[PDB]
Structure 1
Amino acid sequence: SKKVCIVGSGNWGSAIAKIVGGNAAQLAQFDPRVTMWVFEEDIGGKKLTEIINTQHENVKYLPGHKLPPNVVAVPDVVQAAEDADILIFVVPHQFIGKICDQLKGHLKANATGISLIKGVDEGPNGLKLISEVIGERLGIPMSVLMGANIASEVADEKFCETTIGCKDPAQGQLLKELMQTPNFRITVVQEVDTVEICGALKNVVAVGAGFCDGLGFGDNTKAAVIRLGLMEMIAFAKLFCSGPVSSATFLESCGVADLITTCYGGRNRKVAEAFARTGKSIEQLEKELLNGQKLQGPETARELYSILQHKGLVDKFPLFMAVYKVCYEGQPVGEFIHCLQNHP
């Protein structure tokens, strides 16, 4: 039976722990002992790992939810992963570099991985998919899980779906059995890069959606911004992804559904509304409303402008490039509409 290690214990990692723990305790093909690597913290005199292993509640990152008793918190990441056939990577992108340094050399020979990390790394073609970063560093085949999946709602067992991107078909099916429940439904698609690139690009669209909200517009306008954005994400994937790219993938939960949710609510939408209404800078708004964190939407747009410059294709992505110019070239946020309005 296959052993599972959840690498990460935050909001989403704990929500995922509820699903994986519950399936591993019921399904014969998985070992019921699911390890979860927990970055140790002092929670009013008690180690967070001890809290998880005695109270079965991540009181800091998923308070109010019982974790399945078979999920074991492990404060050392090598000890968490050394024995696992399946590694679920679910940490903030900032920390995956360090985690992978500690793990290289210490994994089982046929270990496989699935990344839940939404975002994008750096490399030769400008961007590099995070799952390729992990896989190359650690030498393991990689899958991805991406969808319209807010962690608090998943923890509450409110119905939702998600996309598993996995090249190997038996692996995709194995991962579906691990993570699917009556209220967390899974589609397995044999693409990885197309599933994964939506998670980065959607935040660029969501900044533009926020500008439109900040300008007084409503649902019809947001719907056009999502529609044109989706078209630019499809075209961009076809330019950027190594392999074949079909439009249909973008209608999976990783594409259109996660795009809809992010454009109706989220950090990128909220800050971009504030930017359009208060004229304050993104850096200022990050400090005043995100406690100094980098908003990924504007940063990805700037990265897209560099790629398109390398390819000679800036003029074919007006919505992406309008987000870029409003965030970083001082274009007035009213001209963002002028671009929706003189589009093709």
Structure 2
Amino acid sequence: ASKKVCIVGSGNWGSAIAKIVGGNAAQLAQFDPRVTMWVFEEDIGGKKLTEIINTQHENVKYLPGHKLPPNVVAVPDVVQAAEDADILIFVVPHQFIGKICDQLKGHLKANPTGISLIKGVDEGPNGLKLISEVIGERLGIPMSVLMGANIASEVADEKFCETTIGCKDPAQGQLLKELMQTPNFRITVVQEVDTVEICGALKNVVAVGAGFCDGLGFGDNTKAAVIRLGLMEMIAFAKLFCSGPVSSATFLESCGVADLITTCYGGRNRKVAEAFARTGKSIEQLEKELLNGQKLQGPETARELYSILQHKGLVDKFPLFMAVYKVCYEGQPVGEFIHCLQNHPEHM
């Protein structure tokens, strides 16, 4: 029997993914052509967004200049969207996944599996807690993740790129790959799930600082350095707080070095972080003023890093991460950022 797929989420990335998943489900036999997409209902000029999506087959508010495959159906109730799904792609802003596992808990199919595209980290009474873990625990289903240099707008334009899928079960990995891959969306399945997922979360903090540096008037040599030092801390962080095995070779996958690069140069975090350096407005305000409803995962992830590090009394071990955190939330002048670069340890 063909597998039913449900896309929980519908934003910039969620909509781009819909195009890829919609296209594959329709052309592939192993996947049910009917693909549901949970859409947090919104009123746009009196019309309901779900209505507009199923009528015009496009979510222009979040993914401009693109159509969505007709077979992707917008469903306002999450339970109804996931009810009969065999595979659930979790792709919503970090701050809402919690409540969504709410309603979903206990209303899923027997052997339903899931894959997460959410970038960020959670905290557990005992160390760091991956979003994928939290979701897999609450919903009780096998989890995988997809992480890579995939700025939505470029993906929706079908511009060549790659991504990394973290899945322990080979059979499932080859499965998710057949569902996600495209002649221009090349995937590499990997087993070190945790490392691949933390690369996605942590790279956004680095990108906020990169953004700060642009707002300070610096160029490529500097952004390269911020990227380079942040990578030093990312690997240091993963090897410290991640359960079991953590290899550096994993950071050389799309989820590490490549995602770090494309994000520091063209991600939403870089843009806002640059404006923050210039205007002095709040991360929140700029978020609302510049992203037309899309969510930043950068700042809040830094905030989470802070909490995770202090509960271990190790706040002084990650200068760059904490410098990003302090400028965003503590009021530290952006003009002192360079300083964390000038005194950053040579190795960690």
> Structure 1 CA distance, aligned partners of 2:53 and 2:333?
50
Deviation at 1:59, TM superposition (A): 4.2
- Superposed CA RMSD in Å reads 2.5
Deviation at 1:234, TM superposition (A): 0.5
Structure 1's 98 and 330: CA in aligned 2 closer, same or farther, altered over 3 A? closer
Structure 1's 9 and 307: CA in aligned 2 closer, same or farther, altered over 3 A? closer
Deviation at 1:16, TM superposition (A): 1.0
Decide whether the 8 Å contact of 2:173 with 2:189 is kept in 1: yes
> Structure 2 CA distance, aligned partners of 1:121 and 1:307?
9
Deviation at 1:209, TM superposition (A): 1.5
Deviation at 1:218, TM superposition (A): 0.8
Decide whether the 8 Å contact of 2:205 with 2:302 is kept in 1: yes
For structure 1, the 5+ residue unaligned runs are none
Between stretches 131-140 and 207-216, larger displacement belongs to 207-216
> Structure 2 CA distance, aligned partners of 1:55 and 1:99?
26
Deviation at 1:113, TM superposition (A): 0.6
Matches within 5 A, 1:67-78: 67-78=68-79
Decide whether the 8 Å contact of 2:75 with 2:81 is kept in 1: yes
Structure 1's 210 and 57: CA in aligned 2 closer, same or farther, altered over 3 A? closer
Report percent identity of matched pairs.
100
> Structure 1 CA distance, aligned partners of 2:242 and 2:76?
37
Deviation at 1:278, TM superposition (A): 4.3
Secondary structure in 1 aligned to 2:128? strand
Decide whether the 8 Å contact of 1:126 with 1:306 is kept in 2: no
Structure 1's 194 and 66: CA in aligned 2 closer, same or farther, altered over 3 A? same
Secondary structure in 2 aligned to 1:334? helix
Deviation at 1:212, TM superposition (A): 2.1
> Structure 2 CA distance, aligned partners of 1:196 and 1:341?
29
Secondary structure in 2 aligned to 1:199? helix
CA offsets 1:294-317 (integer angstroms, 9 cap, x no match): 854344334333433343433432
> Structure 1 CA distance, aligned partners of 2:43 and 2:271?
32
Decide whether the 8 Å contact of 2:121 with 2:304 is kept in 1: no
Structure 1's 73 and 275: CA in aligned 2 closer, same or farther, altered over 3 A? closer
Deviation at 1:215, TM superposition (A): 2.6
Deviation at 1:36, TM superposition (A): 1.7
Structure 1's 141 and 297: CA in aligned 2 closer, same or farther, altered over 3 A? same
Deviation at 1:177, TM superposition (A): 0.3
Between stretches 200-209 and 109-118, larger displacement belongs to 200-209
For structure 2, the 5+ residue unaligned runs are none
Structure 1's 117 and 79: CA in aligned 2 closer, same or farther, altered over 3 A? same
User: What residue number does 1:265 align with?
Assistant: 266
Between stretches 207-216 and 170-179, larger displacement belongs to 207-216
Deviation at 1:43, TM superposition (A): 4.4
CA offsets 1:40-64 (integer angstroms, 9 cap, x no match): 3444455433433343333443343
> Structure 2 CA distance, aligned partners of 1:285 and 1:54?
32
User: What residue number does 1:232 align with?
Assistant: 233
Structure 1's 97 and 30: CA in aligned 2 closer, same or farther, altered over 3 A? same
Between stretches 221-230 and 58-67, larger displacement belongs to 58-67
Deviation at 1:152, TM superposition (A): 2.0
> Structure 2 CA distance, aligned partners of 1:97 and 1:312?
27
Deviation at 1:14, TM superposition (A): 1.8
CA offsets 1:205-252 (integer angstroms, 9 cap, x no match): 122212322332210011011011111001101111112111111111
> Structure 1 CA distance, aligned partners of 2:209 and 2:276?
11
Deviation at 1:272, TM superposition (A): 3.0
Structure 1's 35 and 279: CA in aligned 2 closer, same or farther, altered over 3 A? closer
Between stretches 52-61 and 256-265, larger displacement belongs to 52-61
Q: With CA pairs under 8 Å and 6+ residues apart, which has the higher RCO, 1 or 2?
A: 2
Matches within 5 A, 1:1-344: 1-44=2-45, 46-279=47-280, 282=283, 285-286=286-287, 289=290, 296-344=297-345
Decide whether the 8 Å contact of 2:93 with 2:297 is kept in 1: no
Structure 1's 109 and 293: CA in aligned 2 closer, same or farther, altered over 3 A? closer
Structure 1's 231 and 65: CA in aligned 2 closer, same or farther, altered over 3 A? same
Deviation at 1:126, TM superposition (A): 5.0
Deviation at 1:96, TM superposition (A): 1.6
Deviation at 1:150, TM superposition (A): 1.8
Deviation at 1:281, TM superposition (A): 5.3
Decide whether the 8 Å contact of 1:127 with 1:303 is kept in 2: no
> Structure 1 CA distance, aligned partners of 2:60 and 2:180?
23
Between stretches 139-148 and 267-276, larger displacement belongs to 267-276
> Structure 2 CA distance, aligned partners of 1:164 and 1:296?
20
> Structure 2 CA distance, aligned partners of 1:71 and 1:292?
22
> Structure 2 CA distance, aligned partners of 1:203 and 1:327?
13
Deviation at 1:342, TM superposition (A): 2.9
> Structure 2 CA distance, aligned partners of 1:5 and 1:55?
20
